[PDB]
Structures are given as structure tokens and as C-alpha cells.
């Protein structure tokens, strides 16, 4: 019923790069997401104590969110764009398994993740 420690968004001996897809993933894909209407439970980690959900954290054991995702590209965490592409699908994926089927957060979620799918198709060659 607790919370965990949120992922790490530092790790100084991590090696680390500035691509011109990590440009997008953060310029376009987060940018994009984190305005929408939809995205404010993604916005932060999941607060199971607040939210009243107790079994959050013993079904879901990769958290991730945006807020996280905005840090990690902001203090530039990756070192390629298929870590940050995996965060945003580990993101929706523990939407999908947390929540019922049908639930309006599992309709957010979908909101978020076709926008996601449309601004990747086009993501720069390096």
C-alpha cells in the first residue's frame, strides 16, 4: 500500500547522449502528450496512497510515467530513443494491466499512446 522510490532520473555514471531522436522524443512526443487533455494522471508517478490504490505497486513492478520521462530527457538520462520509446510503452502497458478493461483512464491512456504511435512513425533518421 506504500510507494516505492521513483525510478531514477540521474545516474552520473550512466553514459549518455544528445541524438537528434532525443531531440524529437522530447520536443514532439513528450511535448505533445503532456499538453493533451488526458494527461494528467500520467504526468507524475503513481501516488497509491492518495489514490486509494493499494495493490498498485504489487502488480505493477516497472513504473513509469511522464513526468519521469520529461525528467530523464531533460537531464539527458538515454543514451538511444528505444529507452525513452520503451518508457512511454511501459507507461501505457501498466495502464492497460493495473486497470479494467473499458475504465476512462484506460481511454486516456489510448488517447495518448495513438499520438505517440503517429509522432514515432515519423521519427528523424539520426
Sequence with gaps: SMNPPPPETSNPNKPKRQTNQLQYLLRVVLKTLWKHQFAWPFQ??????????????????TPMDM??????????????????????????????????????????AEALEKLFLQKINELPTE
Design 44 to 61: 507524475q508517478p503513481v501516488d497509491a496512497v492518495k489514490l486509494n490504490l493499494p495493490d498498485y505497486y504489487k502488480i505493477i513492478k
Design 67 to 108: 513526468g519521469t520521462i520529461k525528467k530523464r530527457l531533460e537531464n539527458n538520462y538515454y543514451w538511444n530513443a528505444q529507452e525513452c520509446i520503451q518508457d512511454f510503452n511501459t507507461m501505457f502497458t501498466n495502464c492497460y494491466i493495473y486497470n479494467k478493461p473499458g475504465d476512462d483512464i484506460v481511454l486516456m
